[PDB]
Amino acid sequence: KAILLFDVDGTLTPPRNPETHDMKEALLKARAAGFKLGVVGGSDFAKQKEQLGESILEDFDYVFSENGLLAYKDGKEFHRNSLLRALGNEKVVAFVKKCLHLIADLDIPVQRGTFVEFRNGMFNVSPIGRNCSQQERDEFENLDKERHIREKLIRELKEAFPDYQLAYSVGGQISFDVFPKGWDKTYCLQFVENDFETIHFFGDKTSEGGNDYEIFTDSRTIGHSVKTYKDTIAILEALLED
Amino acid sequence: KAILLFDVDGTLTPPRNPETHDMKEALLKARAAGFKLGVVGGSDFAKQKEQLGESILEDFDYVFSENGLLAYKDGKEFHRNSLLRALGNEKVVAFVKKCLHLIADLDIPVQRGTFVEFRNGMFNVSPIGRNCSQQERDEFENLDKERHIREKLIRELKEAFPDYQLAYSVGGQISFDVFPKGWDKTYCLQFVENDFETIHFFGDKTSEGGNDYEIFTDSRTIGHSVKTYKDTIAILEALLED
Ligand SMILES: [Cl-]
Ligand SMILES: [Mg+2]
Ligand SMILES: [Mg+2]
């Protein structure tokens, strides 16, 4: 009894693009050989559907959106957790209020709008604020490297709220992510864990700091670092070669 | 030499919907009679295109998006102003930093994310923050009526920044808008002002507090309060009846 899990963007696709019929057909052959297929991404269902196509649920045995907090199996939602339901309203307004003070008190040069973004399964926090232009993204991306503004706020928030059992991952250029210790991709394992001898995980951001790293290094997982989806298929075809 | 200007959502359409070929054909006949057609909405070009169709620029003589800050004439962008270019970076970070403090210091019960949204031509500010559910919108919409949380912050921001020559309009349920005194729909008049004896304005939010109100009551405008786009056509057809 085996299952194959894939990150989405860059693993089953090019970097930011739709899937190939070469990929689909490689997956179909996987399934046809007796594997079950699952998918896991920090992305919300809408974006995953957008990259795998409308028939995503009919194509994979499991679909873990936002790293598993929204979960489908056999085309059937069977789990839904939220940031709000985990923490609760108080702890949430507390974290937010303090983010807003911290940020309001920075001596950085460019600040715009959308500094604290509350999302189903994570806080996204930006000192410059994500209502900023691409250019301003880069000016600031360079500032941060010199001053570690994201690093500091994280230290500050960590030590304001040790009881919150929260984890901090640095997002892209202007933003960092906060979520309860555990809500990386390994969240989803709790669900397939008990049903498969072997679990293959495919992903591309499996270096430390990456979002595949946790699940990849997990010992219940048989990890597979890939570069592009081209690799992914080779691995599949060899898996089925035998 | 005449021009007909229309608000978009609710004036040329139903409330939140596409335009009718009954509307289009009424507009076409207007144009064919020698009128010029213009369009003005706080909405950004994308949303206006989405409601009038892809051939929007080819259909109206002028298209004033975000109340004129982005402007097309004869299918040709001829004006682009921004909040940033008006105020300048300093004055902007100052306003924002203070919004964030104020908000962080509220004793309201539900706060989420996206409290201060920096947009091309206006600040949108939300105490609860617009990352909130519809239900939470209503809980809070009712709170505000009792406590006037939006009213207070506005007083506070007004008196922090009198020199900023800013105007404050209450948005929907959870949000209020801030922008330089003048950037309501009458912004656009500066452009047609000098080319038309008569300027008809059609709109539906022409009561005080509304976004049609300024332009409607303007004396360079021949105002027309309508209910639905059905009215709009009657007015047109009678205009062309003669
Ligand atoms: Cl914000
Ligand atoms: Mg990946
Ligand atoms: Mg209107």
DSSP calls for A4-18:
EEE-STTTTSSSSSP
Q: How far apart are CA A104 and CA B94, in angstroms?
A: 9
Query: B82-183 is classed in which CATH architecture?
Result: 2-Layer Sandwich (3.30)
Residue intervals of chain B classified under CATH 3.40.50.1000 are: 1-81+184-242
Q: Which ligand sits closest to the CA of B114?
A: 1
Query: A100 CB contacts (<8 Å, ≥6 apart)?
Result: A115, A116, B100, B101, B103, B104, B115
Cβ atoms B60, B77 nearer than 8 A: no
B94 interfacial to chain A (CB closer than 8 Å): no
Tell how far CA B188 is from the center of its chain.
11
Length of chain A: 242
Which residues in chain B have Cβ-Cβ distances shorter than 8 Å to A177? none
Say which amino acid occupies A92.
V
CA distance A222 to chain B (A): 37
Q: Is A9 left (phi over 0), alpha (psi -120 to 50) or beta?
A: beta
| C-beta atoms of B117 and A123 within 8 A | no
Q: What is the resolution of this structure in A?
A: 2.9
Q: How far apart are CA A41 and CA B216, in angstroms?
A: 50
Produce one character per residue of A137-165: b if its CB has 16 or more CB atoms within 10 Å, e if not. Answer: beebeebbeeeebbeebbeebeeeeeebe
| C-beta atoms of B118 and A117 within 8 A | no
Q: How far apart are CA B192 and CA B63, in angstroms?
A: 11
Cβ atoms B75, B134 nearer than 8 A: no
Take residue A172 and report the two structure tokens written for it. 């892209």
Cβ atoms A106, B100 nearer than 8 A: no
DSSP string for chain B = -EEEEE-STTTTSSSSSPPPHHHHHHHHHHHHTT-EEEEEESS-HHHHHHHH-TTHHHH-SEEEEGGGTEEEETTEEEEE--HHHHH-HHHHHHHHHHHHHHHHT---S---S--EEEETTEEEE-SS-SSS-HHHHHHHHHHHHHH-HHHHHHHHHHHH-GGG-EEEEE-SSS-EEEEETT-SGGGGHHHHGGG-SEEEEEES--STTSSSHHHHH-TTSEEEE-SSHHHHHHHHHHHHH-
| C-beta atoms of A104 and B109 within 8 A | no
Q: Tell me the backbone φ, ψ of residue A16, rounded to 5 degrees.
A: 60, 80
CATH class as words, domain B1-81+184-242: alpha beta
Q: How far apart are CA A121 and CA B25, in angstroms?
A: 48
Report the sign of the C-alpha dihedral through residues B58, B60, B65, B69, in that order.
positive
| C-alpha dihedral, B93 to B94 to B98 to B99, nearest 10° | -50
Say which amino acid occupies A204.
D
Take residue A78 and report the two structure tokens written for it. 């069977």
Q: How far apart are CA B177 and CA B210, in angstroms?
A: 12
CA distance A131 to chain B (A): 6
Cβ atoms B127, B106 nearer than 8 A: yes
| C-beta atoms of A110 and B116 within 8 A | no
Q: How far apart are CA B26 and CA B22, in angstroms?
A: 6
Tell how far CA B31 is from the center of its chain.
24
Tell how far CA A191 is from the center of its chain.
17
| C-beta atoms of A119 and B131 within 8 A | yes
Take residue A214 and report the two structure tokens written for it. 């946790």
Please tell me the distance between residue A216's alpha carbon and the centre of ligand 2 in angstroms. 11
Say which amino acid occupies B28.
L
Cβ atoms A39, A9 nearer than 8 A: no
Q: How far apart are CA B154 and CA B11, in angstroms?
A: 29
Experimental method: X-ray
Q: Which of A9, A59, A177, A204 is catalytic?
A: A9
Which residues in chain A have Cβ-Cβ distances shorter than 8 Å to B105? 97
HEC letters along A85-126: HHHCHHHHHHHHHHHHHHHHCCCCCCCCCCCEEEECCEEEEC
Q: How far apart are CA A234 and CA A30, in angstroms?
A: 12
Cβ atoms within 10 Å, residue A85: 10
B121 interfacial to chain A (CB closer than 8 Å): no
Residue intervals of chain B classified under CATH 3.30.1240.20 are: 82-183
Q: Catalytic annotation on B177? A: no
Take residue B207 and report the two structure tokens written for it. 């009561």
